[PDB]
Amino acid sequence: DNSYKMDYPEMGLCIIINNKNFHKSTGMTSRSGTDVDAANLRETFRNLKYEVRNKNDLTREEIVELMRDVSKEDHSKRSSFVCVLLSHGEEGIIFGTNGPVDLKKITNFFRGDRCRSLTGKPKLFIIQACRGTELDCGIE
Amino acid sequence: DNSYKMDYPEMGLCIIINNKNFHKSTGMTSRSGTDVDAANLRETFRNLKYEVRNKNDLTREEIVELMRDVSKEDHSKRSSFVCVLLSHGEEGIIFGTNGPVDLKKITNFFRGDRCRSLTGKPKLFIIQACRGTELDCGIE
Amino acid sequence: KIPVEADFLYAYSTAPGYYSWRNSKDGSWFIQSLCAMLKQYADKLEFMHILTRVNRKVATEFESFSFDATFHAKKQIPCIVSMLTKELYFY
Amino acid sequence: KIPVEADFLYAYSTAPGYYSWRNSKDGSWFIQSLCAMLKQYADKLEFMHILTRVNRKVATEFESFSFDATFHAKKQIPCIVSMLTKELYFY
Numbered sequence: 001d002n003s004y005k006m007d008y009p010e011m012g013l014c015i016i017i018n019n020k021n022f023h024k025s026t027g028m029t030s031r032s033g034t035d036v037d038a039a040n041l042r043e044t045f046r047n048l049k050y051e052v053r054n055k056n057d058l059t060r061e062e063i064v065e066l067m068r069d070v071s072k073e074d075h076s077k078r079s080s081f082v083c084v085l086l087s088h089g090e091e092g093i094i095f096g097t098n099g100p101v102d103l104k105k106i107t108n109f110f111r112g113d114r115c116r117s118l119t120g121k122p123k124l125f126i127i128q129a130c131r132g133t134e135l136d137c138g139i140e
Numbered sequence: 141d142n143s144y145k146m147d148y149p150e151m152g153l154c155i156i157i158n159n160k161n162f163h164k165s166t167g168m169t170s171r172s173g174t175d176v177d178a179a180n181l182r183e184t185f186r187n188l189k190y191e192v193r194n195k196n197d198l199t200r201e202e203i204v205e206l207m208r209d210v211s212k213e214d215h216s217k218r219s220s221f222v223c224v225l226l227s228h229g230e231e232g233i234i235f236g237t238n239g240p241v242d243l244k245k246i247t248n249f250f251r252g253d254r255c256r257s258l259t260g261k262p263k264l265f266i267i268q269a270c271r272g273t274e275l276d277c278g279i280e
Numbered sequence: 281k282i283p284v285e286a287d288f289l290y291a292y293s294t295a296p297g298y299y300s301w302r303n304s305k306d307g308s309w310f311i312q313s314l315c316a317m318l319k320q321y322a323d324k325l326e327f328m329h330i331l332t333r334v335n336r337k338v339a340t341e342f343e344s345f346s347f348d349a350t351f352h353a354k355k356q357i358p359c360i361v362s363m364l365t366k367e368l369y370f371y
Numbered sequence: 372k373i374p375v376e377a378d379f380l381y382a383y384s385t386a387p388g389y390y391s392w393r394n395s396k397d398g399s400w401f402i403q404s405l406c407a408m409l410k411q412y413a414d415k416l417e418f419m420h421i422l423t424r425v426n427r428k429v430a431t432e433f434e435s436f437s438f439d440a441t442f443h444a445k446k447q448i449p450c451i452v453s454m455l456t457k458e459l460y461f462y
């Protein structure tokens with residue numbers, strides 16, 4: 001057996017954190033079109049039998065809390081876990097409407113030792129965010 | 141075609157930088173076993189038809205200089221490029237016998253715009269180095 | 281016993297240190313591409329190969345247009361960070 | 372036109388922030404597994420899949436042993452960082 005067991009009762013969760021509007025203090029502009037994403041994703045993962053859940057404009061505190069809570073649920077009947085983040089960011093950092101949070105912190109709630117119901121199961125994290133300011137000119 | 145073209149005249153280069161002994165000034169210990177790896181790789185890539193070249197105990201300046209030279213070579217008849225690094229190191233860093241060298245620096249020589257003979261060709265970097273001091277305790 | 285950091289897959293929209301492009305009416309390049317590929321290959325290709333298609337699409341069919349030379353004619357390449365132990369199929 | 376960061380593939384022996392294990396007589400766990408998997412599948416599997424086996428083997432079959440309680444019973448997981456545009460086959 002060299003592929004993940006995907007025949008559990010349910011495919012698993014799909015948390016889509018969609019941050020559009022940021023507090024004046026962050027110095028970030030509204031992310032137009034992000035709703036086209038969150039909508040497009042929702043449908044896509046629904047067709048793959050994932051239980052989808054959308055969240056809009058959550059603060060960095062809310063994001064952490066949400067993760068801590070989802071990682072406390074029992075995933076024994078779930079084949080996998082998918083978490084899509086759409087927001088602003090820098091290298092290793094994503095933005096809550098009111099500020100920055102490093103990925104490490106919200107990812108840790110899911111390691112083999114902290115979230116046992118998902119141990120040995122594929123935990124996917126899709127991230128649409130900037131990782132710095134470098135621009136890629138291209139070639140050819 | 142969703143697969144890279146590998147039917148060029150030659151598979152390409154396979155540079156193996158193998159640093160075993162470090163300057164007393166760095167305080168790094170000898171990397172026992174590094175030779176077994178170096179030979180293991182040489183054989184493996186030789187069978188895969190690569191033009192293997194080994195190098196040992198290079199300083200940081202030497203590594204940059206070597207990489208700079210390899211990229212100015214013509215790779216038109218080569219299908220890909222492969223560089224293996226065996227040394228000490230931390231996140232985004234690998235050690236020369238005399239000190240650290242940010243990885244970004246040695247890899248930049250090979251991006252699309254800098255090395256046109258390899259544009260559109262697979263540039264593989266295999267790194268056997270520590271990316272920090274953390275130790276994984278395991279689960280289950 | 282397995283590593284705690286194992287079985288994680290981080291599919292980034294862009295390479296380390298770089299900017300990530302979003303279209304005001306179509307959504308980000310990465311997300312619209314990721315969803316398109318899933319729609320067509322979720323029942324045929326293993327996940328890593330699907331993200332590779334996403335990678336080619338973003339790098340091939342997208343470029344920025346701006347009146348500001350600074351942000352004009354810019355390119356993007358997604359970044360697959362896998363620590364998966366096995367092959368992944370959605371079927 | 373394509374991104375200048377495209378077509379690179381970094382195969383890390385370990386995960387971000389972690390230590391990597393080398394065996395005094397058999398060499399590093401990462402490299403010995405990579406070579407082993409290459410010897411067996413370079414003529415049959417796509418490179419990302421080959422690297423995925425390297426991942427399982429290292430995560431599964433290895434574990435440190437030491438008299439020092441701190442260096443004892445540790446694990447390791449390789450880290451594949453792909454920005455490849457196409458599927459890679461050594462044949």
Ligand SMILES: *C(=O)[C@H](CC(=O)O)NC(=O)c1cncc(-c2ccc(C(=O)O)cc2)c1
Pocket residue numbers: 031087088089090128129130131299300301302303308345346347348351
């Ligand atoms: C950086 O964290 C974010 C990531 C995200 O997905 O939100 N990206 C942007 O802020 C971004 C993305 N796409 C386009 C633009 C932008 C806006 C205006 C111009 C212009 O030329 O006027 C160019 C690019 C910003």
Ligand SMILES: *C(=O)[C@H](CC(=O)O)NC(=O)c1cncc(-c2ccc(C(=O)O)cc2)c1
Pocket residue numbers: 171226227228229230268269270271390391392393394399437439442
């Ligand atoms: C960290 O930069 C390096 C990377 C490398 O490839 O050498 N790793 C080590 O230095 C390393 C890796 N595995 C084992 C050991 C080691 C050394 C001494 C003891 C001891 O008990 O004295 C245990 C393990 C070091």
